[PDB]
From a paper:
The overall structure of Enc subunits across species with different T numbers is conserved and consists of a peripheral domain (P-domain), an axial domain (A-domain), and an extension loop (E-loop).
To explore the structural landscape of encapsulin shell formation, we used 2D and 3D (focused) classification and local symmetry to determine the structure of different stable encapsulin intermediates in an incomplete assembly state. This resulted in structures of three distinct intermediates of the encapsulin shell; a 48-mer (3,427 particles, 5.4 Å), a 52-mer (4,378 particles, 4.5 Å) and a 54-mer (6,294 particles, 4.6 Å). All three stable intermediates have an overall icosahedral structure with RMSD values for the 48,52 and 54-mer compared to the structure of the full shell of 1.08 Å, 0.60 Å and 2.66 Å respectively, although the 54-mer is, compared to the full encapsulin, flattened in one direction and elongated perpendicularly to it. However, all dimers (in total 77) have both Enctb subunits present, and where a subunit around five or three fold symmetry is missing, its dimeric partner is also missing.
Numbering used by the authors:
A (entry chain LA), B (entry chain UA), C (entry chain OA): 1 to 265
The structure:
């Protein structure tokens, strides 16, 4: 067995298939970051750091010796525990199709939110700079009126053009901004369609982020490094409940500072 | 070896591939001129002039002798030096993917700007007349209001129609004008889309030019002659930096005076 | 080419072969550490850190999220520059066999001394704990009289026996201690032979270390990780001299605290 200790969990095979399906579905729906960044293959469990290729000056060991430390970025392992009713698990073999997988959905939504907020806003404790912090283009303010959203977005499209950047540009919106441009309409279309006319990429719902992000998806600018992708593991169990977790280990690198514009309220 | 002296540069193979990729990418993005003019095959290093096929009267050598000089256009070699950190070059073999290629990008942007400004505004010292100067159609004034841009552009489309010209017409805009028609919107579309409806060619971002240019891309009207295309060459190096250059040799010919309209502010 | 920039050096092929032979020979003679520790295959230039498999508690990103940083050990790149006369280099093609390779020998001796002192005494700036510091067995004092050396060494052999350890034990001596037990004799043998009778391993000359070390060579206790093994690289040159360097990148790990005894004066 492995670190998931999956065979020790009192979960049947059919219940496991339903839990895997629910977690994978809810996660994909709430991920916006993997649609725009380069996603590496999983390195594996032993992978601990990503080389940046830079060098750090250290106090010379002896006379005439020049020493340099190799710089690297550590992976962070992110774990979201959740708790399942054993009655709901037992219902699945009897043929129930409405078993309560709400904790699985909440854990997948929380893991997806962490991953997206780590990619776009950073996680300083894990030495990850967000796309918002690593952007060299000027930051823009989103207006109160949703009918004035496409104007400011177009100004962001000016800045990537002034930065000398090609590629399909894509706009990612926070859930508040996505709702505002979805529910306001002008001439038989919502403002989301007006945003769709400005770019050759995609208007992407990004419920974890704040503000908005416009960026190129030409490739090679944004890199998500995975040691291991999302997995479900077993912690402990009692007569009534099974404690499990969702787990993934990653770091994020931004190679190109001028490939994005961040917007705030 | 050749005049690039490329093997003498202290640049690794992987670093060379990254520099070539960065320079080629940034150059294409900033070229507008090659999308509309006929571009010849590279003549080669020995190519020095392009025959125009005209004749120049010279003082008769002797009695009964009629002499004429063949007219030609000289090529100009354009060189943009740039300077790279050797630490950034050394980072590439160690696996860095964020090496500072800003000087390469600035050199490619500057070379592209020179080439486009030479094609459209001319370079008198190199005996190159620009498209703006060689146009026989009347010049138009671009209005201050971007909502009045498509009107004047349509008047330019009248002039090529009054000049008796067929073919897909294409509109090239300066970066100021492109930004103005991109960021102003009317009825759910930016003014750039309104320009796109007027022509069967393309709205082309041309950040080097001034004003705007409307012209036919039927072929055979505008000819860019290349002796050698863009190449990267090695000048000199020290402990910290490598001096290199971008280099291209060309001339530009406009055969058809009535195939274009220039616009100014 | 690579980071060594070897083809840029004004060094002939025969001179290169002599320099490689001299450096490799002098290095092996002065290495004691690789004879007793496990030496990994070279990871390669991109390798920057070694995973330890441990976890570091970090401030929770959000509520209900448990985060942990993966622990790792950075590699250190160690570079010893040296300077060669170009006349000595030119002598080699003419058939000289006494070309002055003293700087190569001094650079190889200095690199070997650094590597051995890093393995056995540590390099705190590179986060490397030495075998002396990581040993859990008690430290012993070497006596002034060399005839009393084998007694104390035998007490060290008691401690590894009290630590519950098997395997061929090996004794490494500093150059002072090796000279003292080599030059003092008892009953027709030097004291080095008396040390040789106590162990089934080897009396190893270790000129870089202080004191003495007794340890098991059963395997899996001491691990030297190499990104890249010893290589010769080219820095710069003038009319008279060529500046080159010896370079290696490594870290050292001690997995088993009770597998060694350190001795001091």
């Amino acid at each position: 067995m492995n670190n998931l200790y999956r065979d020790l969990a009192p979960v049947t095979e059919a219940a496991w298939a339903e839990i895997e399906l629910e977690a994978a579905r809810t996660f994909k729906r709430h991920i916006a970051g993997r649609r725009v960044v380069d996603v590496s293959d999983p390195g594996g469990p032993v992978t601990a750091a990503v080389s940046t290729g830079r060098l750090i000056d250290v106090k010379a060991p002896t006379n005439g010796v020049i020493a340099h430390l190799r710089a690297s970025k550590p992976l962070v392992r992110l774990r979201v525990p959740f708790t399942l009713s054993r009655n709901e698990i037992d219902d699945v073999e009897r043929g129930s199709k409405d078993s309560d997988w709400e904790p699985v959905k909440e854990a997948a939504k929380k893991l997806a939110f962490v991953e997206d907020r780590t990619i776009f806003e950073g996680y300083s404790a894990a030495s990850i700079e967000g796309i918002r912090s690593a952007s060299s283009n000027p930051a823009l303010t989103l207006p109160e009126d949703p009918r004035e959203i496409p104007d400011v977005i177009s100004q962001a499209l000016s800045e990537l053009r002034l930065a000398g950047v090609d590629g399909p540009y894509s706009v990612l919106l926070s859930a508040d901004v996505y709702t505002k441009v979805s529910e306001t309409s002008d001439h038989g279309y919502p403002i989301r369609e007006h945003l769709n006319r400005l770019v050759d990429g995609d208007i992407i719902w990004a419920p974890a982020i704040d503000g908005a992000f416009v960026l190129t998806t030409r490739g090679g600018d944004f890199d998500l490094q995975l040691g291991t992708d999302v997995a479900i593991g077993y912690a402990s169990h009692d007569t009534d409940t099974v404690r499990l977790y969702l787990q993934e280990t990653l770091t994020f690198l931004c190679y190109t500072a001028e490939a994005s514009v961040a917007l705030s309220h």
